[PDB]
Amino acid sequence: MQIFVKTLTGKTITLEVESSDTIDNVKSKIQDKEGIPPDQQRLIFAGKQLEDGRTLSDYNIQKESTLHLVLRLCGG
Amino acid sequence: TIDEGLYSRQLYVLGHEAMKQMSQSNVLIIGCKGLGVEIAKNVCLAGVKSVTLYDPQPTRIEDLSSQYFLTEDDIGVPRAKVTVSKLAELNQYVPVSVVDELSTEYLKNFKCVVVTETSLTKQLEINDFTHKNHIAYIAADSRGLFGSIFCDFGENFICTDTDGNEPLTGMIASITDDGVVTMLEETRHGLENGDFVKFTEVKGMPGLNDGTPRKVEVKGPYTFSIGSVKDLGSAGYNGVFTQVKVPTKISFKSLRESLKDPEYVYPDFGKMMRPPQYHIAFQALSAFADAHEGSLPRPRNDIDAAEFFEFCKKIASTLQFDVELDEKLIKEISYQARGDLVAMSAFLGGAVAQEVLKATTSKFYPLKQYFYFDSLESLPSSVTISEETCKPRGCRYDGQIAVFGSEFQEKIASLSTFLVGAGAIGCEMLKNWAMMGVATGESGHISVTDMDSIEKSNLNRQFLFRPRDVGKLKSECASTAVSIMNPSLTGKITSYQERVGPESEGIFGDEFFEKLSLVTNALDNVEARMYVDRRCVFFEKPLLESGTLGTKGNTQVVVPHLTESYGSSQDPPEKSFPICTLKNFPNRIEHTIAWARDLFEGLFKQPIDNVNMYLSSPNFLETSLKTSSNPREVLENIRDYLVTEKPLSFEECIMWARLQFDKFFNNNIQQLLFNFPKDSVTSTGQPFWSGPKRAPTPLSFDIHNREHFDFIVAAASLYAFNYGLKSETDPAIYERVLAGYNPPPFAPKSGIKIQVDKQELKSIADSLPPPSSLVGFRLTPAEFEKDDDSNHHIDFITAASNLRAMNYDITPADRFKTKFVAGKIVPAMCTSTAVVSGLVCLELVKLVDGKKKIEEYKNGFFNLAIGLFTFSDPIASPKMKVNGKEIDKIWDRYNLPDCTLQELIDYFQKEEGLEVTMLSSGVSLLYANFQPPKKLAERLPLKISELVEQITKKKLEPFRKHLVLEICCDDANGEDVEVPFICIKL
Numbered sequence A: 001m002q003i004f005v006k007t008l009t010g011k012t013i014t015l016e017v018e019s020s021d022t023i024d025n026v027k028s029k030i031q032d033k034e035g036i037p038p039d040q041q042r043l044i045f046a047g048k049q050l051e052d053g054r055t056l057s058d059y060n061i062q063k064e065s066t067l068h069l070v071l072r073l074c075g076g
Numbered sequence B: 001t002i003d004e005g006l007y008s009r010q011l012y013v014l015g016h017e018a019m020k021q022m023s024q025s026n027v028l029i030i031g032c033k034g035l036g037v038e039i040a041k042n043v044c045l046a047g048v049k050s051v052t053l054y055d056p057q058p059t060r061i062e063d064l065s066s067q068y069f070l071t072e073d074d075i076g077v078p079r080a081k082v083t084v085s086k087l088a089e090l091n092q093y094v095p096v097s098v099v100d101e102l103s104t105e106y107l108k109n110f111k112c113v114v115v116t117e118t119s120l121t122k123q124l125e126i127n128d129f130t131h132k133n134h135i136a137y138i139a140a141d142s143r144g145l146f147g148s149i150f151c152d153f154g155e156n157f158i159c160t161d162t163d164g165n166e167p168l169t170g171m172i173a174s175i176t177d178d179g180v181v182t183m184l185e186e187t188r189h190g191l192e193n194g195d196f197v198k199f200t201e202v203k204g205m206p207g208l209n210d211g212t213p214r215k216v217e218v219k220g221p222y223t224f225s226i227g228s229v230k231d232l233g234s235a236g237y238n239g240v241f242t243q244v245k246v247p248t249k250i251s252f253k254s255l256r257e258s259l260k261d262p263e264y265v266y267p268d269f270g271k272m273m274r275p276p277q278y279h280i281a282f283q284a285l286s287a288f289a290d291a292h293e294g295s296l297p298r299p300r301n302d303i304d305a306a307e308f309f310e311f312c313k314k315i316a317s318t319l320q321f322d323v324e325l326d327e328k329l330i331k332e333i334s335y336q337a338r339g340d341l342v343a344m345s346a347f348l349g350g351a352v353a354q355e356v357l358k359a360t361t362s363k364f365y366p367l368k369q370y371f372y373f374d375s376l377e378s379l380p381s382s383v384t385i386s387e388e389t390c391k392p393r394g395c396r397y398d399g400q401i402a403v404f405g406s407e408f409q410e411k412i413a414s415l416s417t418f419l420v421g422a423g424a425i426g427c428e429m430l431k432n433w434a435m436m437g438v439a440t441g442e443s444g445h446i447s448v449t450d451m452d453s454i455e456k457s458n459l460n461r462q463f464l465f466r467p468r469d470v471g472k473l474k475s476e477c478a479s480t481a482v483s484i485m486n487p488s489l490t491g492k493i494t495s496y497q498e499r500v501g502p503e504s505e506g507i508f509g510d511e512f513f514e515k516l517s518l519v520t521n522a523l524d525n526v527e528a529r530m531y532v533d534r535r536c537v538f539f540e541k542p543l544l545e546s547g548t549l550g551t552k553g554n555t556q557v558v559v560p561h562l563t564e565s566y567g568s569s570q571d572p573p574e575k576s577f578p579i580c581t582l583k584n585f586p587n588r589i590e591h592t593i594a595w596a597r598d599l600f601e602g603l604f605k606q607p608i609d610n611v612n613m614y615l616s617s618p619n620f621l622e623t624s625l626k627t628s629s630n631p632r633e634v635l636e637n638i639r640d641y642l643v644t645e646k647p648l649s650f651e652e653c654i655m656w657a658r659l660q661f662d663k664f665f666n667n668n669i670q671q672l673l674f675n676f677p678k679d680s681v682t683s684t685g686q687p688f689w690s691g692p693k694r695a696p697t698p699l700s701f702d703i704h705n706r707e708h709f710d711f712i713v714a715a716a717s718l719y720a721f722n723y724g725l726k727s728e729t730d731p732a733i734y735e736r737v738l739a740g741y742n743p744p745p746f747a748p749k750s751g752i753k754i755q756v757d758k759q760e761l762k763s764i765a766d767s768l769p770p771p772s773s774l775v776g777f778r779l780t781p782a783e784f785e786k787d788d789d790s791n792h793h794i795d796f797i798t799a800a801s802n803l804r805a806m807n808y809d810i811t812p813a814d815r816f817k818t819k820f821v822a823g824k825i826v827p828a829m830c831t832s833t834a835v836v837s838g839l840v841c842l843e844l845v846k847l848v849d850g851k852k853k854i855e856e857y858k859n860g861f862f863n864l865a866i867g868l869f870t871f872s873d874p875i876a877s878p879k880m881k882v883n884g885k886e887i888d889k890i891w892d893r894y895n896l897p898d899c900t901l902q903e904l905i906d907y908f909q910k911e912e913g914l915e916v917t918m919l920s921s922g923v924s925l926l927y928a929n930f931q932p933p934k935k936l937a938e939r940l941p942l943k944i945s946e947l948v949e950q951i952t953k954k955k956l957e958p959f960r961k962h963l964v965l966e967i968c969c970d971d972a973n974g975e976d977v978e979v980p981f982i983c984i985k986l
């Protein structure tokens, strides 16, 4: 199935996944497309951050869901 | 025309063109309560043409719950006429005035009208006109833990930048005739389908470089297509693409026609079902007002809530809203209707302020069109929340008591906080704390620390400061300014000028931390964040963390024994260029600016420091020979800067700068081309000077070249500064001395190592003048200062960079960009700062409520440039199992007194079921079960502090209050197990 990842700078990434796929797998596909190391990826679905070891189903992520990829900032 | 000294950091976000349009846009703001004054503050700081206020309603005591420009002496006085005085002080370039009457035709004077504290009926009346007369409309309202924003910039609004990102660009390797662009050396283009790109320097396809944009189709991370280019060449080679940003027309609906079919911006995809409920509830709030003479429901009043819920039913039917109303949620808005929280006004006020700039600049994507928000997880649960507890009390905090209650108000007042930083986030944080009444109780207190002083550019987003405060300490001014906002804080704030870190643990020690309720960061660097995080973990203190970058920001809460800490997760590392690229093979202006910054340091800083060390350190030469990475350079600096190249006049400084020109933009280039000729090829037959390597060309000095001349002036003036000689700028003296310059002959040598001994250095050291002959003589080093345009620093870097850009055929950059790069200036402005401060304090009330469920906390992320907000529950701390017990791998530790080694071993066996096999302190091994029995017989009766002192052969520092130890031990099954560290309380 297809899901979308929106970044904090407005980019949209489309992924081909299955509900049984792990977050680690989803992060690997994001690394292929964007070059961001999995450990530096902050993914959010329905107000929850995705953690390694779990699966998309564990977060109710379904066809054409939208995740947010975010970062921390250091100005202030 | 634009004062870059004030607007520096904000210009790096909005740009000159945007601010030029702002300086021609009057703004009208209705309502001067907490929300309106926050919007007006940011807009004034932002630099619009002017701000007009309208709020005849008289000042009530409860208005001071969030409106920080109103004192108790102002009660009864209309809010607009009291607030104008203090808003006019923010930005000298933005006149602020009041208007007593609102005429529909009078609205034609403003490019944007912000409407707050206004009924829906009056809103529709205003928006009907503005929507027809090309006037931007924005309406926001803060109701307890609920907020709403509506934007209507007209049905033909042209947005010229829909994301605020810089245009993408990258080096190309090849282009096929069918249009397949392959990036260079696995370099990602970052484009998306539908983007447009221009080209330059493409070989074999001349027509492609003409600048006509071409829509892109992404084939992969390193490849994309632009369509057929057969009519233009058989094969493209090399070159550079640049993204072409396209504008978009945004058609907004009016408030009247969108009221039926509203378009929502969702701030939380976990609360997707709420904005519809809120759309009805905010309208029902205005119907209640019209029914009860402009009065909102009373705090937590059930009768008023029932009548309110009935209005929602009628409105839901009138609007044909096919939605099942959530009674408990909707009634919660009525209960909190009279809530006035400063955090909510900061959050909404910062966002609305940014939307006002969007309407007046056509930059960034505006909210389209309804933004409904709640922080309902902030509602306390450890205290009774009833109509009796939330009732007004006749104090400045009535707006906050309306939501949290009086019992909760006392908890806020007794907080002991620690604010690390008094800059942008710091100023907004202090303002919030003052309005909330933090630390106004008997046991309450605030500690603020910051080692920096106020500067001009700070005044654009650090609103506690004023131009006359320039040069003073931030922590002191901010403390004083907040005492004026809330006199209850007089004497309750202690300010420090300390740099938080290892060196200041004598001030911020155990005794200091133990008293704190929580720590709040307001920092601008990751190093200080990571340090504060370690300390809060050690002292088991909550930490409120936030950051900004231009229009982006984020928040993170660290809850002891519940969540992970700031340092538990990794961020992308700071970019650093390869040394080979800066040293010899630049291809971007960023490479020449970094090189020029190192040149500035290498001509006017490093050698000066070596001279002064040679004259004040007794054994500097010996130590340097054993430690310096380049001892020959140190010896040559001293020799050159004290005798052989010592100038005696500004004329001699000009001669010196003229020599540096050929040394770094000619002779060095010749030597490079000598080792790598232009036509030389690699091992694969391909031209060496290809791809990232650009063939350089040496420069021939030309006094009539602005870049050549600017380098001579800046370099000569800095060399004179080093020696105290008075510099000059009259071009006649430069022409006089330079016209008679005989350059020494130069020939490229051989055998020089260009990446892609003992006797001479001992002899030149003896040729140095002895420090005995230069008693008291020093040179003045140049300390890089990006924000002083009279010191020639940016002049030298700009000119030096652009001269190197001319060597390598790189496009030069002006001082504005060069200052940004060389200075590592973080783009920032007031809007993002207010937004993070609001989100941070919405989490603060959760910490003081003692919330134990991790799902109630929220980390925040946003980008105001695209109207993106999103939130996530914090990550729980990693757990571990030891003898079946759950151990928190971040927060747990064993607290023991300064007992004996034996007593420690017995404690762990009998109380913890752990057989201590090894005990260590730092690098030192204190105890192990395998040590001989005589080693143990003499150590087991010793105290831990005594055991550490003896093994380390070093006495403990006297002010030490704790001792950190680690142990290896076997669990009850005899198996080795990892366990938390030990903290000895001395």
Ligand SMILES: *NS(=O)(=O)NC[C@H]1O[C@@H](n2cnc3c(N)ncnc32)[C@H](O)[C@@H]1O
Pocket (backbone or CB within 6 Å): A075, A076, B420, B421, B422, B423, B424, B425, B449, B450, B451, B452, B474, B498, B499, B500, B501, B522, B523, B524, B525, B528
């Ligand atoms: N974000 S900002 O640039 O507007 N201001 C940040 C603010 O924080 C202070 N700061 C930076 N580093 C420290 C440490 N280590 N301790 C205390 N304060 C610190 C800066 O001076 C700046 O004013």
Ligand SMILES: [Mg+2]
Pocket (backbone or CB within 6 Å): B452, B453, B455
């Ligand atoms: Mg500063």
Ligand SMILES: [Mg+2]
Pocket (backbone or CB within 6 Å): A076, B524
């Ligand atoms: Mg800073």
